[PDB]
């Protein structure tokens, strides 16, 4: 059980908070790049104003 | 023209009804963020939510695994179907 | 008389905000799935009522296996005495 | 300890590391498409200021 245990120690010691960091961060960048498309949708909002005249 | 400044008058309202949902969206738009980092800040601490992500993971996975095994099925069983219509009568007789 | 440019600016103000509505109606509708993203990563019952039943599915398809099939072993002998016919 | 391989074989035949592993291309993704909704976009009004 000790080992069970050390598989999951292992695991959750030192592998799982480096995946919890870079999926957080990448979460972050992924609701962050969500946004910033977001910001290129400002680029368009002056594209869209452009559009008006066109 | 006189009914010009009546269009411009309802026109006028909304300009207000919009100004009041620019507002709207603008403070909603800070309630996201106020949801989102919050969200990030949730993770800094911990929770993630692992076991969540554990089962839900695996609910699809078992998903995928029948499939996969179903093309195994079908391979199987027609490989030895086939081979069985052949070969059990082959010689037919001999 | 001039009246006809007033109208023309409120009007064009007021499309101008309608998109401008729409396009944060937008941005904050978008924000919204990108934190339901969230929301759908940060009823116990189900998922052991499959996760369980997916589980006995597959040991089902296990046996299966072997029905549908393991005769693959049987069948290459007979793979191999068939074509005595030649 | 039998139990509780019945559960960790979850994982070792399928979760955090397979949402980091799609980040890891789905950012890849929305990298693009920021450059190819603004980058892009910059072209598209290239044009557009030279035919306004």
Same mark, same amino acid.
């Given at each position: 059980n000790?080992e069970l245990?050390?598989?999951?120690?292992?695991?959750?010691?030192?592998?799982?908070p480096?995946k919890?960091?870079?999926q957080?961060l990448?979460?972050?960048?992924?609701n962050?790049?969500?946004e910033?498309?977001?910001?290129?949708?400002?680029?368009?909002?002056?594209y869209?104003?452009?559009?008006?005249?066109? | 023209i006189k009914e010009?400044?009546?269009?411009? $008058?309802?026109c006028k309202?909304?300009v207000?009804t919009?100004?009041?949902?620019?507002?709207?969206?603008?403070?909603?738009v800070?309630?996201r963020?106020?949801e989102?980092?919050?969200?990030?800040?949730?993770?800094?601490?911990?929770?993630?939510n692992?076991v969540?992500l554990?089962?839900d993971?695996?609910?699809?996975?078992?998903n995928? !695994?029948? !499939?996969?095994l179903?093309?195994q099925?079908?391979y199987?069983n027609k490989?030895?179907?086939?081979?069985?219509?052949?070969? $059990?009568s !082959?010689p037919?007789?001999?």
């Amino acid at each position: 059980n000790q080992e069970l245990e050390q598989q999951l120690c292992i695991i959750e010691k030192s592998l799982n908070p480096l995946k919890a960091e870079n999926q957080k961060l990448m979460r972050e960048n992924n609701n962050l790049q969500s946004e910033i498309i977001l910001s290129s949708e400002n680029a368009q909002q002056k594209y869209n104003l452009l559009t008006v005249r066109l | 023209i006189k009914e010009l400044q009546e269009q411009l $008058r309802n026109c006028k309202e909304q300009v207000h009804t919009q100004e009041a949902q620019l507002s709207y969206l603008k403070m909603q738009v800070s309630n996201r963020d106020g949801e989102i980092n919050r969200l990030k800040t949730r993770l800094d601490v911990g929770g993630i939510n692992m076991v969540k992500l554990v089962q839900d993971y695996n609910y699809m996975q078992q998903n995928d !695994k029948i !499939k996969l095994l179903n093309h195994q099925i079908d391979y199987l069983n027609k490989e030895n179907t086939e081979m069985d219509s052949i070969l $059990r009568s !082959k010689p037919y007789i001999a």
